[PDB]
Write a protein that binds this ligand. Structure first.
Ligand code: HEM
Ligand code: HEM
Lengths: 141, 146, 297
């Protein structure tokens, strides 16, 4: 459960990402695929090499979805229903994979936002990402 | 842990810039702030009620120094982490009963602290290398549960 | 007692001077001295039998000798006990083999809390001769003008940027520094790329002496120069923007060049008022249309 502090911390930090969100998105995916190569199994016919436009494209989708989450931080179950359909109903992603990508997003954010990635903000981003994850991994139709 | 030449030089080149009196206290501090139940293991350290309190707790900083010390030790013995960490594994598992999930969590907060300090030098392959190290350490520290 | 710093032997096959155009260093110095690019191959203290090769910078003093940046020739690191950080206003210089003394801003090691000490593409400080004359300096990787802020859109620099800096003098065989506290108290310089001007004040104290106020300073590409004043004297400002642009690992532009800044202020031949300074970009905005040097907040 996010605190009120947690919500503003997440809005502020993610607000700073601005129109580089697709780049943060793609870098977190690249970090995931390299650090944890079992995660690649979910993308069986992607090009997952260093340059890949496909990873880039996908990263922007992920990053935009998170921006949508941040904008609807109070009612994420309703906001993210279609993505829960995809990840829990269709794809059946093991939740461990969401911890892996969440960790990689945190690392991406630490590397690019060193003023903003304080201990308190790190704490909120982690809680936020865990909450997003829970929603995308739940069947609640 | 097998590191590649490129990986190994990358890890060590970054490790060389780590301020060994501060970075350990940082990582431990973030553990206590991001995963607050870990505070219970350090009830003896006094005020941990606040992120600033935590991060400025001199016993946190002191104790962090020792945990980084152990990771530094680890870097010289990547091929015998279990042996090297045997005494510590007994302390943490048999005596404190730390849930081993928390060893993985600290490994990961340390990785976040590295990236925080080194920014664009903490490239995806450099991270992947550090993941192998922190996973090695956590598993070695958990050995007595296995 | 502080140990004696011995000159680096650049004759070693481990230390090899860097003649690439992209590693070209620029230095502003009251009485000579320059920062100089090397590739340096050294063993790791953490894994034996390794040799690590990295790009680095050394300081060449006026007497011709080269020095590295280490614990003892850099500004006392502020204490970490509280959330708060104070920079001590007075610091010892490190005695050299030559008779001289040295101070510089920072090492390449990690730290927290005080951004103006976390320089990655430049150094500043002072060298004192065996004769007690001082050459103050500031030097580094100049900010390539093709990737200054506004250039992507407008083909020339545009907007404003605001930097947080520390000034340094030498007084009584000690390095003395402008007031710096976490900001709570610091020194801010703002570049206006619309007008080509630089404004701001290096805030003095008991030890540093009087503040240095930027009076009329013009900016052109990645250089600036002009006048400052301090305690009714006029000094000459010379300086530059530093640091290459920052890119995402994709190659896309993340931050423009010139994320660091530095210079000297010269009040007179061997005047003890003479200063170096350096610092880091705290806010920028290419689409700013303001025509003054008021600070970004
Ligand atoms: C913050 C976490 C995540 C977010 C916000 C997210 C978001 C999305 C979005 C927006 C899409 C595309 C839906 C569309 O096309 O409109 C998508 C597709 C996908 N996601 Fe996720 N996702 C996340 C985590 C994961 C993880 C951890 C995995 C697997 C390891 C995963 C696997 C996939 C796959 C396989 C697709 C479909 C790609 C295809 O077309 O083949 N996702 N995700
Ligand atoms: C890889 C992770 C870790 C490493 C390398 C590590 C290392 C160490 C080291 C070197 C000591 C000092 C023991 C001595 O002086 O002989 C220690 C003590 C301790 N560790 Fe850890 N540790 C880790 C993770 C954890 C975690 C996750 C917790 C709790 C959540 C924890 C709780 C403690 C406690 C409570 C002590 C106190 C011992 C005492 O006060 O007598 N450690 N650890």
């Amino acid at each position: 459960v996010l605190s009120p502090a947690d919500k503003t911390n997440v809005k502020a930090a993610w607000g700073k990402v601005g129109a580089h969100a697709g780049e943060y998105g793609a870098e977190a995916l690249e970090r995931m695929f390299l650090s944890f190569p079992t995660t690649k199994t979910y993308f069986p016919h992607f090009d997952l090499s260093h340059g890949s436009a496909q990873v880039k494209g996908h990263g922007k989708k992920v990053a935009d979805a998170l921006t949508n989450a941040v904008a609807h931080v109070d009612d994420m179950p309703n906001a993210l229903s279609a993505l829960s359909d995809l990840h829990a109903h269709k794809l059946r992603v093991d939740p461990v994979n969401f911890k892996l990508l969440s960790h990689c997003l945190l690392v991406t954010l630490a590397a690019h936002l060193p003023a903003e990635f304080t201990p308190a903000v790190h704490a909120s981003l982690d809680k936020f990402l865990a909450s997003v994850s829970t929603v995308l991994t739940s069947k609640y139709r | 842990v097998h590191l590649t030449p490129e990986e190994k030089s990358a890890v060590t080149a970054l490790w060389g810039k780590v301020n060994v009196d501060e970075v350990g206290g940082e990582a431990l501090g973030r553990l206590l702030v991001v995963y607050p139940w870990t505070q219970r293991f350090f009830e003896s350290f006094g005020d941990l009620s606040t992120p600033d309190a935590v991060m400025g707790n001199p016993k946190v900083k002191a104790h962090g120094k020792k945990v980084l010390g152990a990771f530094s030790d680890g870097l010289a013995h990547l091929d015998n982490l279990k042996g090297t960490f045997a005494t510590l594994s007994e302390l943490h598992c048999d005596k404190l009963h730390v849930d081993p999930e928390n060893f993985r969590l600290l490994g990961n907060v340390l990785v976040c602290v590295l990236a925080h300090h080194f920014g664009k030098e903490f490239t995806p392959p450099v991270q992947a290398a550090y993941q192998k190290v922190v996973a090695g350490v956590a598993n070695a520290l958990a050995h007595k549960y296995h | 007692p502080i140990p004696v710093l011995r000159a680096v032997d650049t004759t070693s096959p481990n230390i090899v001077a860097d003649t690439s155009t992209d590693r070209e260093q620029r230095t502003f110095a009251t009485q000579g001295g320059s920062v100089k690019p090397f590739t340096i191959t050294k063993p790791s203290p953490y894994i034996p039998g390794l040799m690590l090769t990295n790009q680095e910078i050394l300081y060449q003093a006026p007497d011709g000798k080269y020095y590295d940046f280490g614990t003892y020739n850099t500004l006392i690191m502020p204490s970490s006990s509280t959330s708060a950080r104070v920079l001590p206003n007075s610091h010892p210089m490190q005695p050299l083999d030559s008779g001289g003394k040295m101070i510089a801003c920072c090492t390449n090691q990690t730290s927290t809390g005080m951004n103006a000490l976390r320089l990655k593409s430049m150094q500043f400080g002072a060298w004192m001769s065996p004769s007690k004359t001082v050459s103050l300096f500031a030097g580094g990787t100049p900010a390539p003008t093709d990737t200054l802020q506004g250039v992507d859109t407008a083909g020339r620099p545009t907007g404003k940027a605001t930097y947080e800096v520390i000034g340094l003098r030498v007084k009584n065989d000690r390095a003395v520094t402008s007031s710096y506290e976490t900001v709570v108290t610091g020194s801010f310089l703002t570049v206006n790329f619309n007008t080509g001007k630089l404004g701001g004040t290096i805030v003095g104290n008991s030890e540093f002496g009087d503040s240095i106020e930027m009076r009329d300073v013009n900016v052109n590409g990645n250089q600036f120069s002009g006048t400052a004043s301090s305690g009714g004297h006029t000094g000459q400002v010379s300086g530059g923007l530093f640091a290459k642009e920052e890119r995402f690992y994709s190659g896309t532009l993340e931050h423009p060049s010139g994320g660091e800044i530095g210079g000297t202020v010269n009040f007179g031949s061997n005047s003890p008022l003479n200063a170096s300074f350096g610092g880091t970009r705290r806010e920028y905005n290419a689409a700013d249309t303001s025509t003054d040097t008021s600070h970004l907040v």
